[PDB]
């Protein structure tokens, strides 16, 4: 489709200004943030899950903050 599945990144020779570059960095964080910015109600309930389980401290967060990004656009 014209939506996702872009040629980026080519990365074959091509040491140059790409067609669209800076906007590609803001794809992943913002629109996933924007949704959880859209639903802080999710952000309230989301990160509590990992700390409920395993009692393993530092890795209990591995679920939390990373599953936050999982929610937008699956």
């Amino acid at each position: 489709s014209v939506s996702v599945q872009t040629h980026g990144e080519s990365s074959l020779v091509n040491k140059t200004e790409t067609w669209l570059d800076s906007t590609k960095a803001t794809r992943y964080l913002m629109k996933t943030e924007n949704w959880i910015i859209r639903n802080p109600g999710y952000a309230f309930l989301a990160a509590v899950l990992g700390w409920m389980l395993g009692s393993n401290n530092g890795q209990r967060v591995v679920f939390t903050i990373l599953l936050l990004l999982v929610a937008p656009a699956y």
Partner: protein, 500 residues
């Protein structure tokens, strides 16, 4: 106006105890109301029509870069100056031209450029809002009396037959009463204030058509956009691009039409058609039928004394009952139409009930066609019409035996509960106690939770429940079901409801 052959036709169970019922009805669905003394009533929204709509803002989804002007300055001249910043029609961009002694300057590698390109929109698109004072609700109402395959399908006829009516309710004038003539008068008490949320969204024109978009989400559209009226825009650069500075040369280039993206950007959106007004399709409305003046003609007329005939052969609804149409040979009309639903020929006991109550020959006219429906029961039954061998019968079978229907009753409830949220409890019409708190159970709860983690689509929140599954098996006793409640249902339910 009628329920005849309608796609969603779900009959209405009169509990009696009132001539009034609070109702929730929709554009697609038709509601068929049977009650004591109260004949079979068709109630359907025609559509939801918001009359006068205002443009909330505008968006340019396709732009054209015009007049690219790059004013270059020497290295260490710092900020470049291209005066087109004084014209908002232009888009200006600072920058630099890397230099040798050869190109344009007496130093190397640095420079300054001010790149101004006149913005011009190639194609723009507009969202619009709805003032509920402009909302209509077109509700065709009908009652099953003497009917044909035509009149019962032709409202103009049942206008004269006075079995059907159409109308509009507003937050201004929520309630209306309407007469059925011979059958008397009924009342509808609506809440067009409560029917939709006019401000839950906008009406977004994308291409010729317009579409529903959450007005929160609608502003969130990232794209060159517009004062609802006219001109001065925001981020109009997001359709435009830039280049290198080769000497002074740099070009701003506009993206092609993003309309395809706009369509891509519309998933949950709904097709809406402006005419003089938008006509919305999906109904959500809360009205109160009141039947106190609805009555029954025909109790005096005698049993029709002559050969009946199928004007059309016995056929099931698909909604669970069998409708026929009778052309009646006898001229004894107007006459009460003998007909029943019995189990076996060898038994005379009526088993099923009349969909269309009190079948009535309208006139003495010979072979005058009368379209009537009854309810067959489960298994085998017989449409039986008339008395004495000039009567005719016909076999019927309906395999829907109560168990499966009990699910169709029950399991539809959850489907009727979820996705209708709190408003699902007017299916509990003439409620209180049980059903009243039943709303209040989901009322304050549904206004949180399901909506708080809402905005997730299909598997997203479904997989969340799928991610919530193992917390049921991994838990402590009496704490197992606690984290397990939101797992199944209300979450996977809507995620199972749409499979796919």
């Amino acid at each position: 106006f009628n329920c005849l052959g309608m796609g969603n036709r779900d009959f209405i169970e009169g509990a009696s105890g009132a001539t009034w019922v609070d109702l929730v009805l929709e554009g697609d669905s038709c509601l068929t109301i049977m009650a004591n003394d109260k004949p079979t009533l068709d109630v359907r929204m025609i559509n939801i029509e918001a009359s006068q709509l205002a443009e909330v803002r505008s968006y340019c989804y396709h732009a054209s870069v015009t007049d690219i002007s790059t004013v270059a300055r020497c290295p260490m001249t710092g900020e470049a100056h291209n005066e087109k910043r004084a014209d908002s029609s232009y888009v200006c961009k600072q920058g630099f031209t890397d230099r040798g002694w050869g190109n344009g300057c007496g130093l190397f590698g640095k420079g300054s450029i001010d790149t101004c390109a006149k913005f011009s929109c190639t194609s723009k698109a507009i969202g619009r809002t709805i003032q509920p004072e402009n909302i209509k609700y077109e509700v065709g109402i009908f009652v099953h009396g003497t009917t044909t395959s035509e009149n019962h399908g032709n409202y103009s006829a049942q206008v004269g037959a006075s079995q059907a009516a159409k109308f509009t309710v507003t937050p201004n004038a929520p309630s209306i009463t309407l007469k059925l003539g011979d059958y008397g008068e009924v009342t509808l008490d609506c809440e067009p204030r409560s029917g939709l949320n006019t401000e839950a969204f906008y009406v977004m024109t994308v291409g010729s058509k317009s579409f529903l978009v959450h007005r929160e989400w609608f502003h969130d559209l990232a794209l060159p956009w517009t004062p609802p009226s006219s001109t001065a825009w925001r981020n109009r650069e997001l359709l435009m691009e830039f280049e290198e500075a080769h000497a002074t040369k740099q070009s701003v280039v506009a993206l092609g039409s993003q309309e395809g993206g706009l369509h891509q950007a519309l998933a949950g959106a709904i097709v809406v058609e402006y005419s003089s007004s938008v006509k919305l399709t999906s109904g959500h409305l809360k009205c109160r039928l009141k039947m106190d003046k609805l009555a029954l003609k025909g109790t005096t007329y005698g049993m029709c004394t002559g050969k009946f005939s199928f004007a059309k052969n016995p056929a099931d609804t698909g909604h669970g009952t069998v409708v026929i149409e009778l052309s009646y040979s006898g001229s004894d009309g107007p006459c009460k139409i003998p007909i029943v639903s019995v189990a076996s020929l060898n038994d005379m006991t009526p088993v099923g009930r009349l969909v269309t109550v009190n079948p009535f020959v309208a006139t003495s006219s010979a072979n005058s066609k009368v379209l009537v429906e009854m309810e067959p029961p489960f298994g085998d039954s017989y449409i039986v019409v008339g008395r004495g061998d000039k009567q005719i019968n016909h076999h019927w079978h309906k395999a829907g035996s109560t168990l499966g229907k009990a699910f169709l009753t029950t399991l539809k409830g959850a489907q009727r509960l979820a996705a209708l949220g709190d408003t699902a409890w007017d299916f509990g019409s003439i409620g209180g106690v049980f059903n009243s708190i039943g709303k209040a159970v989901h009322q304050v709860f549904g206004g949180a939770f399901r909506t708080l983690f809402g905005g997730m689509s299909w598997i997203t929140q479904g997989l969340m429940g799928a991610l919530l599954l193992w917390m049921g098996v991994n838990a402590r006793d009496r704490s197992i079901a606690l984290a397990f409640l939101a797992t199944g249902g209300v979450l996977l339910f809507l995620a199972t409801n749409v499979h796919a």
